[PDB]
mmCIF file of all heavy atoms in Angstrom:
data_model
loop_
_atom_site.group_PDB
_atom_site.id
_atom_site.type_symbol
_atom_site.label_atom_id
_atom_site.label_comp_id
_atom_site.label_asym_id
_atom_site.label_seq_id
_atom_site.Cartn_x
_atom_site.Cartn_y
_atom_site.Cartn_z
ATOM 1 N N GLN A 1 95.738 117.817 96.703
ATOM 2 C CA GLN A 1 95.595 116.541 97.403
ATOM 3 C C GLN A 1 94.707 115.604 96.582
ATOM 4 O O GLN A 1 93.830 114.901 97.080
ATOM 5 C CB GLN A 1 95.181 116.783 98.880
ATOM 6 C CG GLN A 1 96.280 117.545 99.620
ATOM 7 C CD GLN A 1 95.848 118.361 100.828
ATOM 8 O OE1 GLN A 1 94.842 119.076 100.799
ATOM 9 N NE2 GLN A 1 96.619 118.250 101.897
ATOM 10 N N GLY A 2 94.990 115.609 95.285
ATOM 11 C CA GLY A 2 94.371 114.688 94.354
ATOM 12 C C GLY A 2 92.953 115.059 93.951
ATOM 13 O O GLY A 2 92.354 114.347 93.126
ATOM 14 N N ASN A 3 92.411 116.153 94.492
ATOM 15 C CA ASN A 3 91.057 116.574 94.137
ATOM 16 C C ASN A 3 91.115 117.301 92.805
ATOM 17 O O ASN A 3 91.439 118.497 92.753
ATOM 18 C CB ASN A 3 90.469 117.495 95.216
ATOM 19 C CG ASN A 3 89.065 117.962 94.879
ATOM 20 O OD1 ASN A 3 88.482 117.538 93.890
ATOM 21 N ND2 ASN A 3 88.519 118.833 95.707
ATOM 22 N N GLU A 4 90.842 116.574 91.720
ATOM 23 C CA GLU A 4 91.034 117.157 90.386
ATOM 24 C C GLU A 4 90.130 118.387 90.267
ATOM 25 O O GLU A 4 90.419 119.319 89.517
ATOM 26 C CB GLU A 4 90.761 116.115 89.280
ATOM 27 C CG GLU A 4 89.319 115.652 89.255
ATOM 28 C CD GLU A 4 88.973 114.709 88.121
ATOM 29 O OE1 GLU A 4 89.842 113.928 87.683
ATOM 30 O OE2 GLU A 4 87.807 114.741 87.674
ATOM 31 N N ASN A 5 89.073 118.438 91.062
ATOM 32 C CA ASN A 5 88.132 119.555 90.988
ATOM 33 C C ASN A 5 88.665 120.917 91.488
ATOM 34 O O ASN A 5 88.127 121.968 91.146
ATOM 35 C CB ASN A 5 86.817 119.194 91.676
ATOM 36 C CG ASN A 5 85.989 118.207 90.865
ATOM 37 O OD1 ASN A 5 85.305 117.339 91.419
ATOM 38 N ND2 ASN A 5 86.055 118.330 89.540
ATOM 39 N N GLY A 6 89.743 120.894 92.267
ATOM 40 C CA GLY A 6 90.388 122.109 92.740
ATOM 41 C C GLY A 6 91.491 122.598 91.802
ATOM 42 O O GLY A 6 92.059 123.679 91.968
ATOM 43 N N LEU A 7 91.763 121.807 90.769
ATOM 44 C CA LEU A 7 92.797 122.168 89.821
ATOM 45 C C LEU A 7 92.382 123.343 88.955
ATOM 46 O O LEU A 7 91.170 123.538 88.725
ATOM 47 C CB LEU A 7 93.058 120.980 88.879
ATOM 48 C CG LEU A 7 93.575 119.696 89.526
ATOM 49 C CD1 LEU A 7 93.435 118.539 88.511
ATOM 50 C CD2 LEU A 7 95.015 119.835 89.970
ATOM 51 N N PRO A 8 93.355 124.116 88.474
ATOM 52 C CA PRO A 8 93.059 125.130 87.444
ATOM 53 C C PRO A 8 92.406 124.424 86.269
ATOM 54 O O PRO A 8 92.762 123.268 86.013
ATOM 55 C CB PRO A 8 94.442 125.638 87.042
ATOM 56 C CG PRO A 8 95.306 125.381 88.245
ATOM 57 C CD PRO A 8 94.793 124.081 88.816
ATOM 58 N N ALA A 9 91.524 125.092 85.543
ATOM 59 C CA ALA A 9 90.765 124.411 84.496
ATOM 60 C C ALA A 9 91.661 123.767 83.433
ATOM 61 O O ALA A 9 91.362 122.642 82.971
ATOM 62 C CB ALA A 9 89.771 125.415 83.831
ATOM 63 N N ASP A 10 92.747 124.431 83.055
ATOM 64 C CA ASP A 10 93.603 123.866 82.014
ATOM 65 C C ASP A 10 94.292 122.583 82.484
ATOM 66 O O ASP A 10 94.443 121.629 81.734
ATOM 67 C CB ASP A 10 94.608 124.898 81.476
ATOM 68 C CG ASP A 10 95.710 125.248 82.467
ATOM 69 O OD1 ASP A 10 95.427 125.552 83.628
ATOM 70 O OD2 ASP A 10 96.901 125.302 82.123
ATOM 71 N N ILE A 11 94.696 122.564 83.743
ATOM 72 C CA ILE A 11 95.344 121.376 84.284
ATOM 73 C C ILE A 11 94.314 120.268 84.514
ATOM 74 O O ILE A 11 94.606 119.062 84.280
ATOM 75 C CB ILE A 11 96.053 121.726 85.600
ATOM 76 C CG1 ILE A 11 97.054 122.875 85.381
ATOM 77 C CG2 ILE A 11 96.756 120.496 86.158
ATOM 78 C CD1 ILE A 11 98.183 122.554 84.377
ATOM 79 N N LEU A 12 93.113 120.622 84.962
ATOM 80 C CA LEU A 12 92.059 119.637 85.074
ATOM 81 C C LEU A 12 91.785 118.932 83.749
ATOM 82 O O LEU A 12 91.670 117.694 83.698
ATOM 83 C CB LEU A 12 90.760 120.249 85.585
ATOM 84 C CG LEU A 12 89.573 119.302 85.514
ATOM 85 C CD1 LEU A 12 89.774 118.141 86.465
ATOM 86 C CD2 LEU A 12 88.345 120.112 85.910
ATOM 87 N N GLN A 13 91.731 119.703 82.669
ATOM 88 C CA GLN A 13 91.494 119.089 81.359
ATOM 89 C C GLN A 13 92.591 118.099 80.997
ATOM 90 O O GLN A 13 92.322 117.028 80.447
ATOM 91 C CB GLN A 13 91.376 120.217 80.337
ATOM 92 C CG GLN A 13 90.790 119.783 78.952
ATOM 93 C CD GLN A 13 91.856 119.581 77.931
ATOM 94 O OE1 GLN A 13 93.015 119.931 78.130
ATOM 95 N NE2 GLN A 13 91.471 119.011 76.774
ATOM 96 N N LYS A 14 93.836 118.431 81.308
ATOM 97 C CA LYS A 14 94.932 117.524 80.997
ATOM 98 C C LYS A 14 94.916 116.307 81.920
ATOM 99 O O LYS A 14 95.189 115.181 81.480
ATOM 100 C CB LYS A 14 96.279 118.233 81.097
ATOM 101 C CG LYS A 14 96.490 119.315 80.015
ATOM 102 C CD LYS A 14 97.831 119.929 80.211
ATOM 103 C CE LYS A 14 97.965 121.293 79.515
ATOM 104 N NZ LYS A 14 97.457 121.365 78.151
ATOM 105 N N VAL A 15 94.633 116.519 83.209
ATOM 106 C CA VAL A 15 94.586 115.402 84.145
ATOM 107 C C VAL A 15 93.486 114.423 83.736
ATOM 108 O O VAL A 15 93.683 113.204 83.800
ATOM 109 C CB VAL A 15 94.411 115.933 85.588
ATOM 110 C CG1 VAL A 15 93.982 114.801 86.531
ATOM 111 C CG2 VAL A 15 95.726 116.524 86.075
ATOM 112 N N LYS A 16 92.305 114.936 83.351
ATOM 113 C CA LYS A 16 91.254 114.006 82.903
ATOM 114 C C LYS A 16 91.710 113.202 81.704
ATOM 115 O O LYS A 16 91.414 112.008 81.624
ATOM 116 C CB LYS A 16 89.984 114.761 82.533
ATOM 117 C CG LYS A 16 89.233 115.319 83.732
ATOM 118 C CD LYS A 16 87.942 115.985 83.272
ATOM 119 C CE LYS A 16 87.148 116.599 84.428
ATOM 120 N NZ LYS A 16 86.178 117.635 83.947
ATOM 121 N N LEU A 17 92.418 113.843 80.768
ATOM 122 C CA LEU A 17 92.934 113.127 79.609
ATOM 123 C C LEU A 17 93.956 112.046 79.974
ATOM 124 O O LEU A 17 93.904 110.914 79.462
ATOM 125 C CB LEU A 17 93.568 114.115 78.637
ATOM 126 C CG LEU A 17 92.516 114.847 77.807
ATOM 127 C CD1 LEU A 17 93.121 116.065 77.115
ATOM 128 C CD2 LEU A 17 91.858 113.900 76.827
ATOM 129 N N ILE A 18 94.886 112.395 80.855
ATOM 130 C CA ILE A 18 95.915 111.445 81.224
ATOM 131 C C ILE A 18 95.242 110.315 81.990
ATOM 132 O O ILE A 18 95.531 109.138 81.747
ATOM 133 C CB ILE A 18 97.011 112.100 82.084
ATOM 134 C CG1 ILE A 18 97.729 113.187 81.280
ATOM 135 C CG2 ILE A 18 98.054 111.041 82.444
ATOM 136 C CD1 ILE A 18 98.621 114.107 82.135
ATOM 137 N N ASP A 19 94.329 110.639 82.904
ATOM 138 C CA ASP A 19 93.609 109.567 83.590
ATOM 139 C C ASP A 19 92.896 108.630 82.604
ATOM 140 O O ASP A 19 92.918 107.391 82.757
ATOM 141 C CB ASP A 19 92.583 110.152 84.536
ATOM 142 C CG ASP A 19 93.187 110.801 85.767
ATOM 143 O OD1 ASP A 19 94.392 110.650 86.046
ATOM 144 O OD2 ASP A 19 92.408 111.475 86.495
ATOM 145 N N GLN A 20 92.258 109.242 81.606
ATOM 146 C CA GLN A 20 91.484 108.480 80.624
ATOM 147 C C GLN A 20 92.378 107.577 79.805
ATOM 148 O O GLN A 20 91.958 106.467 79.396
ATOM 149 C CB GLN A 20 90.685 109.451 79.740
ATOM 150 C CG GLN A 20 89.446 109.982 80.425
ATOM 151 C CD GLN A 20 88.629 111.063 79.655
ATOM 152 O OE1 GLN A 20 89.153 111.824 78.801
ATOM 153 N NE2 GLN A 20 87.331 111.143 79.995
ATOM 154 N N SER A 21 93.604 108.024 79.551
ATOM 155 C CA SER A 21 94.496 107.272 78.700
ATOM 156 C C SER A 21 94.754 105.888 79.285
ATOM 157 O O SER A 21 95.040 104.945 78.551
ATOM 158 C CB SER A 21 95.819 108.023 78.446
ATOM 159 O OG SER A 21 96.680 107.988 79.587
ATOM 160 N N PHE A 22 94.686 105.749 80.613
ATOM 161 C CA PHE A 22 95.013 104.465 81.190
ATOM 162 C C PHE A 22 93.953 103.416 80.905
ATOM 163 O O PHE A 22 94.227 102.231 81.148
ATOM 164 C CB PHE A 22 95.208 104.595 82.719
ATOM 165 C CG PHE A 22 96.440 105.334 83.072
ATOM 166 C CD1 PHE A 22 96.356 106.630 83.593
ATOM 167 C CD2 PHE A 22 97.691 104.782 82.799
ATOM 168 C CE1 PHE A 22 97.496 107.337 83.877
ATOM 169 C CE2 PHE A 22 98.850 105.520 83.090
ATOM 170 C CZ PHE A 22 98.740 106.799 83.617
ATOM 171 N N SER A 23 92.776 103.807 80.393
ATOM 172 C CA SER A 23 91.842 102.768 79.933
ATOM 173 C C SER A 23 92.436 101.987 78.759
ATOM 174 O O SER A 23 92.007 100.847 78.469
ATOM 175 C CB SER A 23 90.519 103.372 79.495
ATOM 176 O OG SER A 23 89.878 104.000 80.585
ATOM 177 N N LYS A 24 93.427 102.581 78.094
ATOM 178 C CA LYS A 24 94.014 101.992 76.914
ATOM 179 C C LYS A 24 95.375 101.369 77.194
ATOM 180 O O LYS A 24 95.912 100.647 76.349
ATOM 181 C CB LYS A 24 94.193 103.096 75.856
ATOM 182 C CG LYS A 24 92.870 103.598 75.291
ATOM 183 C CD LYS A 24 93.120 104.797 74.424
ATOM 184 C CE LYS A 24 91.815 105.276 73.860
ATOM 185 N NZ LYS A 24 92.005 106.584 73.142
ATOM 186 N N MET A 25 95.968 101.684 78.347
ATOM 187 C CA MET A 25 97.363 101.287 78.611
ATOM 188 C C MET A 25 97.426 100.406 79.849
ATOM 189 O O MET A 25 97.216 100.880 80.978
ATOM 190 C CB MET A 25 98.220 102.545 78.864
ATOM 191 C CG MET A 25 98.151 103.586 77.731
ATOM 192 S SD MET A 25 99.483 104.769 77.808
ATOM 193 C CE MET A 25 99.136 105.637 79.382
ATOM 194 N N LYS A 26 97.645 99.111 79.632
ATOM 195 C CA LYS A 26 97.748 98.133 80.715
ATOM 196 C C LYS A 26 98.980 97.316 80.458
ATOM 197 O O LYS A 26 99.349 97.093 79.297
ATOM 198 C CB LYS A 26 96.530 97.195 80.721
ATOM 199 C CG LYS A 26 95.191 97.871 80.533
ATOM 200 C CD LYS A 26 94.759 98.587 81.773
ATOM 201 C CE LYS A 26 93.370 99.230 81.568
ATOM 202 N NZ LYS A 26 92.294 98.325 82.060
ATOM 203 N N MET A 27 99.677 96.889 81.515
ATOM 204 C CA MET A 27 100.866 96.064 81.311
ATOM 205 C C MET A 27 100.498 94.707 80.726
ATOM 206 O O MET A 27 99.622 94.030 81.258
ATOM 207 C CB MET A 27 101.529 95.769 82.664
ATOM 208 C CG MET A 27 102.042 96.971 83.400
ATOM 209 S SD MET A 27 102.790 98.223 82.327
ATOM 210 C CE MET A 27 102.954 99.543 83.573
ATOM 211 N N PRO A 28 101.152 94.297 79.644
ATOM 212 C CA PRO A 28 100.883 92.964 79.090
ATOM 213 C C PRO A 28 101.586 91.833 79.826
ATOM 214 O O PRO A 28 101.277 90.665 79.561
ATOM 215 C CB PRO A 28 101.419 93.088 77.668
ATOM 216 C CG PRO A 28 102.547 93.991 77.773
ATOM 217 C CD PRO A 28 102.091 95.060 78.799
ATOM 218 N N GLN A 29 102.512 92.133 80.735
ATOM 219 C CA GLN A 29 103.261 91.076 81.395
ATOM 220 C C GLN A 29 103.738 91.667 82.712
ATOM 221 O O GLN A 29 103.802 92.906 82.829
ATOM 222 C CB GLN A 29 104.485 90.666 80.556
ATOM 223 C CG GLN A 29 105.495 91.798 80.358
ATOM 224 C CD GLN A 29 106.641 91.450 79.395
ATOM 225 O OE1 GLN A 29 106.986 92.246 78.525
ATOM 226 N NE2 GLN A 29 107.229 90.280 79.566
ATOM 227 N N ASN A 30 104.054 90.814 83.692
ATOM 228 C CA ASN A 30 104.731 91.260 84.918
ATOM 229 C C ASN A 30 106.040 91.926 84.498
ATOM 230 O O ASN A 30 106.765 91.409 83.680
ATOM 231 C CB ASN A 30 105.061 90.070 85.818
ATOM 232 C CG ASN A 30 103.826 89.339 86.300
ATOM 233 O OD1 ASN A 30 102.682 89.831 86.239
ATOM 234 N ND2 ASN A 30 104.053 88.138 86.835
ATOM 235 N N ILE A 31 106.292 93.124 85.005
ATOM 236 C CA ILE A 31 107.430 93.903 84.553
ATOM 237 C C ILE A 31 108.115 94.618 85.711
ATOM 238 O O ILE A 31 107.487 94.922 86.749
ATOM 239 C CB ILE A 31 106.918 94.911 83.491
ATOM 240 C CG1 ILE A 31 108.059 95.636 82.794
ATOM 241 C CG2 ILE A 31 105.924 95.884 84.101
ATOM 242 C CD1 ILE A 31 107.649 96.160 81.448
ATOM 243 N N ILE A 32 109.400 94.857 85.523
ATOM 244 C CA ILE A 32 110.182 95.657 86.451
ATOM 245 C C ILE A 32 110.386 97.049 85.837
ATOM 246 O O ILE A 32 110.794 97.172 84.663
ATOM 247 C CB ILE A 32 111.565 95.009 86.678
ATOM 248 C CG1 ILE A 32 111.459 93.616 87.316
ATOM 249 C CG2 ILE A 32 112.386 95.918 87.526
ATOM 250 C CD1 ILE A 32 110.699 93.557 88.602
ATOM 251 N N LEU A 33 110.128 98.091 86.646
ATOM 252 C CA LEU A 33 110.269 99.486 86.225
ATOM 253 C C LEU A 33 111.092 100.216 87.249
ATOM 254 O O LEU A 33 111.173 99.778 88.394
ATOM 255 C CB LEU A 33 108.895 100.163 86.124
ATOM 256 C CG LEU A 33 107.870 99.465 85.242
ATOM 257 C CD1 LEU A 33 106.502 100.121 85.494
ATOM 258 C CD2 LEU A 33 108.299 99.498 83.748
ATOM 259 N N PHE A 34 111.725 101.313 86.853
ATOM 260 C CA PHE A 34 112.632 102.007 87.774
ATOM 261 C C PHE A 34 112.356 103.474 87.894
ATOM 262 O O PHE A 34 111.949 104.106 86.948
ATOM 263 C CB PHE A 34 114.064 101.808 87.293
ATOM 264 C CG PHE A 34 114.490 100.384 87.306
ATOM 265 C CD1 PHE A 34 114.412 99.605 86.152
ATOM 266 C CD2 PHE A 34 115.000 99.835 88.474
ATOM 267 C CE1 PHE A 34 114.822 98.264 86.170
ATOM 268 C CE2 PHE A 34 115.381 98.478 88.495
ATOM 269 C CZ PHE A 34 115.297 97.728 87.353
ATOM 270 N N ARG A 35 112.649 104.038 89.069
ATOM 271 C CA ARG A 35 112.544 105.483 89.247
ATOM 272 C C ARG A 35 113.648 105.954 90.173
ATOM 273 O O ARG A 35 113.846 105.408 91.258
ATOM 274 C CB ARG A 35 111.170 105.904 89.829
ATOM 275 C CG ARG A 35 111.027 107.436 90.030
ATOM 276 C CD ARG A 35 109.676 107.922 90.513
ATOM 277 N NE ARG A 35 109.351 107.434 91.838
ATOM 278 C CZ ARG A 35 108.185 107.683 92.449
ATOM 279 N NH1 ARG A 35 107.284 108.461 91.871
ATOM 280 N NH2 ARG A 35 107.967 107.185 93.654
ATOM 281 N N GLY A 36 114.320 107.017 89.773
ATOM 282 C CA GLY A 36 115.303 107.646 90.655
ATOM 283 C C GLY A 36 114.702 108.779 91.441
ATOM 284 O O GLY A 36 113.723 109.426 91.022
ATOM 285 N N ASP A 37 115.306 109.036 92.597
ATOM 286 C CA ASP A 37 114.797 110.108 93.423
ATOM 287 C C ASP A 37 115.810 110.672 94.356
ATOM 288 O O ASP A 37 116.909 110.167 94.457
ATOM 289 C CB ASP A 37 113.618 109.655 94.246
ATOM 290 C CG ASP A 37 112.511 110.671 94.192
ATOM 291 O OD1 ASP A 37 112.789 111.913 94.184
ATOM 292 O OD2 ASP A 37 111.340 110.315 94.103
ATOM 293 N N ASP A 38 115.414 111.778 94.979
ATOM 294 C CA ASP A 38 116.272 112.479 95.942
ATOM 295 C C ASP A 38 115.703 112.371 97.330
ATOM 296 O O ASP A 38 114.584 111.891 97.506
ATOM 297 C CB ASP A 38 116.393 113.939 95.518
ATOM 298 C CG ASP A 38 117.004 114.077 94.165
ATOM 299 O OD1 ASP A 38 118.187 113.712 94.029
ATOM 300 O OD2 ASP A 38 116.370 114.528 93.189
ATOM 301 N N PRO A 39 116.462 112.770 98.346
ATOM 302 C CA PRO A 39 116.021 112.553 99.732
ATOM 303 C C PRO A 39 114.679 113.192 100.091
ATOM 304 O O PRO A 39 114.030 112.736 101.036
ATOM 305 C CB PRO A 39 117.151 113.173 100.553
ATOM 306 C CG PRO A 39 118.342 112.957 99.681
ATOM 307 C CD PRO A 39 117.825 113.352 98.285
ATOM 308 N N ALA A 40 114.250 114.231 99.355
ATOM 309 C CA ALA A 40 112.947 114.811 99.619
ATOM 310 C C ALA A 40 111.808 113.784 99.538
ATOM 311 O O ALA A 40 110.757 113.970 100.164
ATOM 312 C CB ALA A 40 112.689 116.002 98.680
ATOM 313 N N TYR A 41 112.038 112.686 98.813
ATOM 314 C CA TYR A 41 111.060 111.620 98.707
ATOM 315 C C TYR A 41 110.691 111.102 100.100
ATOM 316 O O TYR A 41 109.552 110.682 100.328
ATOM 317 C CB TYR A 41 111.650 110.490 97.844
ATOM 318 C CG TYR A 41 110.792 109.259 97.821
ATOM 319 C CD1 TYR A 41 109.578 109.257 97.147
ATOM 320 C CD2 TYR A 41 111.186 108.113 98.504
ATOM 321 C CE1 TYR A 41 108.769 108.146 97.154
ATOM 322 C CE2 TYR A 41 110.393 106.964 98.498
ATOM 323 C CZ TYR A 41 109.198 106.981 97.797
ATOM 324 O OH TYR A 41 108.400 105.841 97.812
ATOM 325 N N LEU A 42 111.646 111.140 101.023
ATOM 326 C CA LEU A 42 111.463 110.604 102.368
ATOM 327 C C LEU A 42 110.760 111.540 103.359
ATOM 328 O O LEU A 42 110.493 111.163 104.530
ATOM 329 C CB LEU A 42 112.816 110.159 102.935
ATOM 330 C CG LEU A 42 113.561 109.148 102.082
ATOM 331 C CD1 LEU A 42 114.911 108.875 102.719
ATOM 332 C CD2 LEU A 42 112.740 107.837 101.950
#
């Protein structure tokens, strides 16, 4: 439930890295993005 502290240590290390990466990645312009999904989404 998003508590990175309950994650296995290896996954916590990767989650911290991916979280950190967003300090470097910001949209330069208003953009449209897409995602497909299945009914489980609902």
Side-chain angles (χ1 to χ4, degrees):
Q1 296 155 315
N3 180 5
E4 65 176 31
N5 287 145
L7 298 166
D10 71 311
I11 304 299
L12 171 66
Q13 194 260 349
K14 293 180 199 315
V15 165
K16 288 183 181 160
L17 281 165
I18 297 167
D19 288 349
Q20 282 175 334
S21 75
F22 290 108
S23 297
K24 291 172 179 172
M25 305 197 295
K26 316 285 182 94
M27 297 322 170
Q29 62 186 134
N30 297 344
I31 189 157
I32 298 305
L33 306 169
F34 297 96
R35 180 176 64 183
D37 225 323
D38 299 295
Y41 172 71
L42 304 176

